[PDB]
């Protein structure tokens, strides 16, 4: 019979139509240009993109494209193999060495994404006798990595050092052997930088390891763009740092875990995504080696980005919008209702501003928002223009007075 | 205090030392050339690679490199965004449409790897009231995808249709709502092709969905290279098919899930790796569109691959070796002892043959082997050389008489 399978398919169709009615259906907008500030969409119109992880504006940089091409010319198109078989080229090692040095760590191991780095981290290093204490606002990739781990789990309210301490005492009282605190370096839907000084101080007091996902920090957060550990001045106090090559560092693909030598080598020996998934492509490896140099010499880019973030926040703050977070390129405009968020975004596009509405499940129901993201590429003029558009539409939709 | 953190690092060091003592430490060998049959290693010497997923020899093909370059010239280096925000270009949709048509499915959704396509599949479609029945030999990526799902789990011995039916009865009698059978199309460490005819017939009898991971079949298995569903004559009967772009289809990176339109759209709306991980890079998207045309152009590469597989299996079997599986490019030479596998691999490189030893945890302890993989790029002479080297070393080591 096909009664149950028929139901499976019918409920999917029903649930999709229901999502649409509730303003929860994500529609993909086709972009026909390369990733940059000024993009072109399907109908050929030009709009300013204010929602990319292209923080330093390098996603379409000539130098990275050139490096990628040179990489394919000398090292090929694909490895067609996981690292331990025949997927390790000299350039993979050069990149890992360069990454470890950049982050101030002993070694680094490559993955095809930070989602995988996180997924293949916890289960490999901790077990049933251990405990993991996570910030409740942690990224989905951290949560899923922790779900695959046998360690006892505990959670503390976002940036709440009082609860973190309570959970640490709880874990230790329960007899946990090794304890690890896991937190985003920057909470991506809120534009909030973690309180790593507070976290590390507690880690010392309770003998716990510290893991930080710096996907939305590496390359532009910190005076040398090293990440949240530099920004919070706890360099050397974070045991494990994971990151991505798909954000500020090029935006193509790839991720990694940087830590002490023992951790990294054990990950190479037992991390499932590393053992059972393709090695990073030569084009990405080559371009990533080049991007780290561009980042190290990107002080002017960071200055621009930082100036852009303060301009947009200051101006939107003056306009009366409710904005989450502080001191980061991610500036979420809080709207609550998903239908209003989608409408606001569509109206903004008519005004030449490209942003996306965020709603369940990427963010909680009732807490919909438009997460804007500044880039070093944006000009003061574009930002003023975006602000004037947000203000006009915000007033028309009853979002602001 | 720091007793526990100190112990954490010491134990990792102890674990590493214990691993190499038992012949379970994987050393990576640096390759300085592009991926191909005749590769170059660190010291500049040339060796023939018989352990790559480069089934059609396209990993360093000039047409793919050219397509990748053109893709970057028009679409940039990276998307620096997940698909629903600003990571969808016209080319992403084009590739998904081409993949769907190629596989004989309604639609397809791209991921950065098949590891993640599997990881983000099950949890999104099934829940606590459902059941997943898995072939015991399933790949780690399927297993980890199932581990994130709340559905009740059942396992059946590899290719055991009797036990598969037993579990289907068990699940249904237990009151399961939706039941899904999950299986590799080709089991990668053994070179065994799944019995999809038997699986699908049973799926109909018990009203169950069927999922197949065709990573080691898409592009070269089947008269038209469509995969195990074509080979087993069950095209259209497999509800969900996942695959990779990192094997026969180029070998760079990327994965996908193909299924009915409503399944695919629901995945776009709720699959975690899709919502919270970078969109596929333009270079890979472009090259992938080209590779599908290359696979379709004719049967020449597939013919050579199968002739090569036939030759190696016949010659190695006549030479006295114990081999696993049948009828596939993957031809495992069973050695049992990890120390012997490691030694055999090293001795083979001295003879100009590059293969790798496989042991715990990639395969059970006591079941070490050297998994060879034929490629359309291999020549009859290279294979004969390989067989002669294997024979010579095998006799020297006492693996064969
Ligand atoms: C290369 C191997 O040794 C082989 N590959 C992994 C694999 C995947 C993952 O593909 P991605 O690189 O993540 O796109 C998916 N399914 C299967 C069945 C396999 O084998 C392996 O694991 O042996
Ligand atoms: C692009 C977003 O909207 C943002 N990015 C994801 C993310 C990752 C995954 O990086 P990969 O693309 O897998 O290399 C890892 N950590 C964090 C903290 C985030 O946010 C997002 O999720 O909102």
UniProtKB/Swiss-Prot annotation, chains A, B:
Binds 1 pyridoxal phosphate per subunit. Its EC number is 2.3.1.29. Keywords: Acyltransferase, Pyridoxal phosphate, Transferase. Pfam families: Aminotran_1_2 (PF00155). SUPFAM superfamilies: PLP-dependent transferases. GO terms for cellular component: cytoplasm; cytosol. Pathway: Amino-acid degradation; L-threonine degradation via oxydo-reductase pathway; glycine from L-threonine: step 2/2. Substrate binds at residues 139, 371. The modification N6-(pyridoxal phosphate)lysine is found at residue 247. Its cofactor is pyridoxal 5'-phosphate. CDD domains: KBL_like. Pyridoxal 5'-phosphate binds at residues 114-115, 188, 213-216, 244-247, 277-278. InterPro entries: 2am3keto_CoA_ligase, Aminotrans_II_pyridoxalP_BS, Aminotransferase_I/II_large, AON_synthase_class-II, PyrdxlP-dep_Trfase, PyrdxlP-dep_Trfase_major, PyrdxlP-dep_Trfase_small. One of its GO terms (biological process) is biosynthetic process. One of its GO terms (molecular function) is metal ion binding. It catalyses: glycine + acetyl-CoA = (2S)-2-amino-3-oxobutanoate + CoA. Belongs to the class-II pyridoxal-phosphate-dependent aminotransferase family. NCBIfam families: 2am3keto_CoA (TIGR01822), PRK06939.1 (NF005394). Homodimer. Catalyzes the cleavage of 2-amino-3-ketobutyrate to glycine and acetyl-CoA. This is 2-amino-3-ketobutyrate coenzyme A ligase. The gene is kbl.
